Design a protein around this ligand. Structure first.
Ligand SMILES: *[C@@H]1O[C@H](CO)[C@@H](O[C@@H]2O[C@H](CO)[C@@H](O[C@@H]3O[C@H](CO[C@H]4O[C@H](CO)[C@@H](O)[C@H](O[C@H]5O[C@H](CO)[C@@H](O)[C@H](O)[C@@H]5O)[C@@H]4O)[C@@H](O)[C@H](O[C@H]4O[C@H](CO)[C@@H](O)[C@H](O)[C@@H]4O)[C@@H]3O)[C@H](O)[C@H]2NC(C)=O)[C@H](O)[C@H]1NC(C)=O
Ligand SMILES: *[C@@H]1O[C@H](CO)[C@@H](O)[C@H](O)[C@H]1NC(C)=O
Ligand SMILES: *[C@@H]1O[C@H](CO)[C@@H](O)[C@H](O)[C@H]1NC(C)=O
Ligand SMILES: *[C@@H]1O[C@H](CO)[C@@H](O)[C@H](O)[C@H]1NC(C)=O
Length: 289
């Protein structure tokens, strides 16, 4: 019932509860107040923290996890930790993430890996091109291709930008951490009379799945669906035009074959990452006035 004077941090796997300094004793319980049987948590008297994984220490609720604690006459607090699209939104000009709304607010971004990893506060991150747009029902985190720490691969005219990101949403007394790798191949499109071809420079990830028009296809099945893959010296993916839609752009005198949206799911041996692209064959003849 009372507001919790400490701070809570939600991560992908565990929640950490920090208490303020007082010259405290806490336990993990269910909403009724009884010790959870299978919950194992860690107390750090030096850091004044309680740490627990979501499994076995929280109840699964709509859109996240809920933990209840008891403090000692005997006050009880509850915390909500959101469950957090790993798919990268890949466009010709930048990368972005579309995320469920979390709960004016601040944020921080960590860019890179290990030693190269660097942390930025809102000023420096925005100065570098990062932005967070809190629209209704979801949030958008804007990642520029040319931010420091982005790996830039090139093969011919196709480019690939890859970077590891640890985004921290900051609100008074709460922090939510989202981690993912952003991967975008802007301008990978190639077309001829009969096919559309997507070329991506060679990089550690290797293709595992393709999704388009709510159809999920593993690599092994691609050939039986009019899609052929060449994985040597980078990715070259050929879609038959009979699977694509057709549209008439207002700047074009002829129809363009295109896909409404294409999701490419790659496997890096540690983790699986996805990118969503919006590929279309180039206009043949423009409108001239
Ligand atoms: C537009 O661009 C597209 C994309 O590249 C072109 O379509 C592809 O053209 C290439 C080159 O001709 C084709 O590869 C050749 O395939 C033949 C025989 O194909 C069989 O073996 C393939 C390999 O396993 C297999 O993928 C095929 O199945 C697909 O393709 C057929 C059409 O070919 C289609 O009907 C099916 O439904 C599948 O989609 C099929 O089983 C093969 O003999 C060729 O090998 C020779 O050449 C290579 C080098 O290219 C050489 O290494 C070999 O030793 C041998 O000498 C070659 O592999 C490919 O199949 C076409 N399709 C796709 C999806 O990529 C298209 O031609 C372009 N059009 C124009 C107008 O330019
Ligand atoms: C903990 O989980 C195991 C496995 O699901 C279950 O068998 C057990 O009853 C649970 N509770 C305790 C107290 O072990
Ligand atoms: C949670 O409990 C299940 C069984 O109920 C057990 O299999 C699993 O290993 C536990 N996870 C953690 C993180 O303790
Ligand atoms: C490249 O980065 C600088 C600052 O980091 C930014 O001003 C510029 O707009 C970026 N490039 C593009 C094409 O936006």
């Amino acid at each position: 019932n009372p507001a919790f004077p400490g701070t809570v941090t939600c991560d992908e796997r565990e929640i950490t509860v920090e208490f303020p300094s007082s010259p405290w004793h806490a336990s993990v319980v269910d909403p009724l107040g009884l010790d959870m049987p299978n919950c194992t948590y860690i107390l750090d008297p030096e850091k004044l923290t309680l740490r627990a994984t979501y499994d076995n220490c929280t109840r699964r609720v709509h859109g996240g996890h809920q933990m209840t604690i008891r403090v000692m006459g005997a006050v009880m607090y509850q915390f909500f930790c959101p469950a957090m699209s790993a798919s990268t939104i890949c466009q010709k000009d930048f990368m972005s993430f579309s995320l469920p709304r979390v709960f004016q607010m601040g944020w921080s971004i960590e860019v890179g890996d290990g030693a190269r990893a660097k942390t930025l506060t809102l000023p420096e991150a925005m100065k570098e091109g990062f932005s967070l747009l809190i629209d209704n029902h979801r949030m958008t985190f804007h990642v520029p291709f040319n931010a420091t720490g982005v790996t830039h691969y090139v093969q011919g005219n196709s480019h690939l930008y890859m970077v590891s990101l640890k985004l921290t949403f900051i609100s008074p007394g709460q922090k939510v951490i989202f981690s993912s790798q952003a991967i975008c191949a802007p301008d990978p499109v190639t077309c001829n009379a009969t096919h559309m071809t997507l070329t991506i420079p060679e990089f550690p990830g290797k293709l595992k799945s393709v999704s388009f028009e709510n159809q999920n296809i593993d690599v092994s099945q691609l050939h039986d669906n009019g899609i052929d893959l060449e994985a040597t010296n980078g990715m070259k993916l050929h879609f038959s035009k009979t699977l694509l839609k057709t549209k008439l752009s207002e700047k074009c005198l002829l129809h363009q074959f295109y896909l409404a949206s294409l999701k490419l799911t790659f496997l890096l041996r540690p983790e699986t990452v996805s990118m969503v692209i919006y590929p279309e064959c180039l206009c043949e003849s423009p409108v001239s006035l």
